[PDB]
Enzyme design. Structure first.
Site, mmCIF file in Angstrom:
data_model
loop_
_atom_site.group_PDB
_atom_site.id
_atom_site.type_symbol
_atom_site.label_atom_id
_atom_site.label_comp_id
_atom_site.label_asym_id
_atom_site.label_seq_id
_atom_site.Cartn_x
_atom_site.Cartn_y
_atom_site.Cartn_z
ATOM 1 N N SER A 384 -0.417 -5.048 6.655
ATOM 2 C CA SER A 384 -0.020 -4.983 5.282
ATOM 3 C C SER A 384 1.479 -5.526 5.136
ATOM 4 C CB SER A 384 -0.266 -3.533 4.869
ATOM 5 O OG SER A 384 -1.557 -3.435 4.207
HETATM 6 C C1 LIG Z 1 -2.446 -3.146 5.077
HETATM 7 O O1 LIG Z 1 -2.521 -3.098 6.374
HETATM 8 C C2 LIG Z 1 -3.457 -2.120 4.403
HETATM 9 N N1 LIG Z 1 -4.456 -1.636 5.289
HETATM 10 C C3 LIG Z 1 -5.555 -2.161 5.365
HETATM 11 O O2 LIG Z 1 -6.028 -3.096 4.894
HETATM 12 C C4 LIG Z 1 -6.525 -1.445 6.685
HETATM 13 C C5 LIG Z 1 -6.563 0.106 6.533
HETATM 14 C C6 LIG Z 1 -6.335 0.644 7.847
HETATM 15 C C7 LIG Z 1 -6.387 2.155 7.706
HETATM 16 C C8 LIG Z 1 -6.693 2.854 6.577
HETATM 17 C C9 LIG Z 1 -6.912 2.328 5.504
HETATM 18 C C10 LIG Z 1 -6.819 0.678 5.103
HETATM 19 C C11 LIG Z 1 -2.779 -0.886 3.732
HETATM 20 N N2 LIG Z 1 -1.297 -0.627 4.326
HETATM 21 C C12 LIG Z 1 -1.416 0.540 4.947
HETATM 22 C C13 LIG Z 1 0.044 1.049 5.258
HETATM 23 O O3 LIG Z 1 0.944 0.542 4.443
HETATM 24 O O4 LIG Z 1 0.309 1.917 6.045
HETATM 25 C C14 LIG Z 1 -2.319 1.531 4.362
HETATM 26 C C15 LIG Z 1 -2.854 2.695 5.230
HETATM 27 C C16 LIG Z 1 -1.611 2.257 2.985
HETATM 28 S S1 LIG Z 1 -3.846 0.257 3.834
#
Ligand SMILES: *C(=O)[C@@H](NC(=O)Cc1ccccc1)[C@@H]1N[C@@H](C(=O)O)C(C)(C)S1
Length: 640
Positions: A384
């Protein structure tokens, strides 16, 4: 001129036989043991070359300026000039000569002692004296020892001084308990094949203070390579090992009684750290009477190497990982100086270079978490955190409006029914989402829609302005970052996933810290720099200064807003702009599904430091943001 063509072939394939290390086939081309023909027999030549060329480690025999003529009925004299490589460097301008013998259709070589070395006469001998060069140290940006060659304190046992019966068995356990060692390893080390009754058999190395010595605990001070940080900089620095006989065959300028770097900077800088072997290669006669000197140069020690690493930041970044799988990169984003290149889990470099029990080496090679891997050089999916790059691209080409508010309903979304069952997922159910809200809550549906709206063509135009495909100038072996496997997504689903840092993206933490350096230089990409004396190379106009002036104030809210993903860092009370992110990994070792936590953070007031931490195959409720407060405090008041 009809047989001279075969005569020049004789000298050609003769030097080739010597250059190929095959002295027997080179001796078969000589004449017969006579006064004017070959001066020695068959095996007398084999032993003459093998003892002389083998002692000086002669390799790579090249010749030039050949001149084969005539003189008698079969004495077609030949002469040329040659060059070779030995233990003390390169021999140049070696004038060779000799004669040939063309009886019937087999032209042989009248061997003479001047065919080994130019000025060798009848029964002359060669001597080689060498003094090994001391290996240079590796120091950090402030002159701290990272990889020096210092004095060590050893611990061994003599089997005779252990007593005279059952007393040895009790002291074999008394030595094992007084120095924290296995009792079965002491009695095994004293019962090897090479052990003699009075031989001093070593055991382990005392780390510092010498405890009480039981019944025969000799402490022989020895010198060797010492790494003060240990595991903290193991992947970066590396380790040195004993030089083998097959290593000298590749590079004869190595001291066979010395050390060679096996991994990391000890190997990537082996030429600059080992120095050059000094000594003299002279031709003598009879009783060591120095006739002519071939090579003689002084011993040059290894050059000390100063890095941009901070020893205190390297140890703090490693300790903050708590032994879990991960890595951390801390830089000064305006110059590129990598202050810390940590990787975890790690091995012990002092244990590898000072003798390690093969049972413990199997533990490192069979460890599932792979402690040998340099994870700061391993390509990962950025996660992310990559939304900063996607948003900055969307602001440059006018695709994304910072104030435009998208309406997203629920937690799943897909463009059309042509996506089957795949849907972009988000964690928070915010109805009104703009750019500021998407970076705070880390909304994937917003970035997925704005990426498809951007178009694949316009997306790569902004991505190509980064370091994708480029190989950085660093002494660290790594693969260049890639946008995808091919030069075309050819999938709307793959385009959306690449929007929020998934899909087929591979960027290692060192490359991530380089691409994210634009937010600390107003759109100018500063390349990372590991050697302290290197110039500060940069790359301007990667993203517009307008997008930096828009995203950086939003990244502050990722820390300061109560619903920000990095809100736990607000406890530090320092100016911070951060952006967290996880990443799904579907490895086929298990049917669960590992996920990697990431974190990017820097100081937006002075741009003094930039940090990129990550945790590979993270445990539950664990995150890179949780274990980042320690070095963020250090980097805040030490690199402003
Ligand atoms: C960015 O990588 C997002 N995550 C995903 O697309 C996969 C995911 C993995 C585990 C739980 C939910 C989603 C978002 N960014 C993270 C972060 O910023 O820590 C989140 C857990 C908020 S989802």
């Amino acid at each position: 001129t009809q047989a001279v063509e075969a005569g020049e072939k004789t000298v050609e394939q003769f030097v080739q036989a010597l250059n190929k290390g095959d002295y027997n086939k080179a001796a078969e081309m000589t004449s017969k043991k006579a006064a004017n023909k070959s001066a020695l027999s068959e095996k007398e030549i084999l032993d003459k070359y093998q003892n002389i060329y083998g002692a000086a480690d002669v390799k790579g025999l090249q010749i030039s300026n050949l001149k084969v003529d005539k003189k008698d009925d079969s004495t077609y004299s030949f002469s040329y000039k040659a060059k070779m490589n030995t233990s003390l460097g390169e021999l140049k301008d070696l004038s060779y000569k000799g004669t040939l013998d063309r009886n019937d259709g087999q032209t042989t070589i009248n061997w003479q002692p001047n065919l080994v070395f130019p000025e060798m006469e009848g029964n002359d001998k060669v001597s080689l004296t060498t003094q090994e060069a001391a290996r240079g140290n590796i120091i950090d940006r402030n002159g701290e020892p990272l990889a020096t060659t210092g004095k060590l304190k050893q611990l061994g046992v003599v089997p005779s001084k252990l007593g005279d019966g059952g007393e040895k068995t009790a002291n074999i356990k008394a030595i094992a308990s007084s120095f924290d060692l296995t009792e079965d390893a002491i009695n095994q080390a004293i019962s090897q094949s090479w052990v003699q009754p009075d031989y001093f058999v070593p055991l382990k190395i005392i780390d510092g203070a010498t405890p009480e010595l039981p019944a025969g605990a000799t402490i022989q001070e020895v010198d060797g390579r010492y790494y003060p940080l240990g595991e903290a900089a193991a992947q970066l620095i590396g380790y040195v090992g004993d030089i083998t006989a097959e290593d000298i065959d590749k590079n004869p300028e190595l001291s066979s009684n010395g050390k060679i770097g096996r991994s990391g900077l000890e190997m990537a800088f082996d030429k600059d750290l080992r120095g050059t072997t000094g000594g003299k290669l002279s031709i003598t006669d009879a009783d060591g009477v120095e006739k002519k000197v071939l090579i003689e140069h002084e011993v040059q020690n290894g050059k000390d190497i100063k890095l941009t690493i901070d020893a205190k930041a390297q140890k703090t970044a490693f300790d903050s990982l708590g032994g879990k799988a991960g890595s951390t990169v801390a830089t000064t984003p305006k110059t590129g100086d990598l202050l810390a290149l940590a990787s975890s889990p790690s091995y012990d470099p002092n244990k590898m270079t000072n003798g390690i029990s093969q049972e413990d080496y199997k533990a490192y090679e069979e460890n599932p978490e792979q402690p040998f891997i340099s994870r700061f050089a391993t390509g990962y999916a950025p996660g992310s955190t990559f939304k900063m790059i996607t948003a900055a691209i969307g602001l440059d080409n006018g695709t994304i409006d910072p104030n435009e508010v998208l309406t997203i309903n629920g937690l799943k979304w897909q463009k059309d029914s042509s996506w089957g069952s795949y849907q972009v997922t988000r964690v928070s159910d915010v109805s009104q989402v703009d750019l500021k809200t998407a970076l705070i809550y880390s909304d994937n549906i917003y970035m997925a829609q704005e990426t498809l709206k951007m178009g694949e063509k316009k997306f790569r135009i902004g991505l190509d302005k980064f370091i994708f495909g480029e190989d950085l100038d660093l002494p660290i072996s790594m693969n260049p970052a890639q946008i995808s496997n091919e030069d075309s997504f050819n999938s709307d689903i793959l385009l959306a996933d690449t929007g929020y840092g998934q899909g087929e993206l591979l960027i290692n933490p060192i490359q991530q810290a380089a691409m994210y350096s634009v937010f600390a230089n107003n759109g100018t990409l500063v390349y990372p720099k590991l050697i302290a004396d290197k110039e500060t190379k940069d790359k301007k106009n990667v993203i517009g200064e307008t997008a930096v002036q828009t995203i950086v104030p939003d990244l502050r809210e990722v820390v300061q807003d109560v619903n920000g993903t990095a809100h736990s860092l607000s406890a530090l009370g320092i100016p911070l702009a951060a952006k967290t992110g996880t990443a799904e990994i579907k490895e086929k070792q298990d049917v669960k599904g590992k996920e990697n936590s990431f974190l990017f953070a820097f100081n937006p007031d002075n741009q003094g430091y930039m940090m990129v931490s990550m945790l590979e195959n993270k445990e539950d409720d664990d995150s890179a943001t949780k274990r980042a407060s320690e070095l963020l405090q250090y980097l805040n008041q030490n690199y402003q």
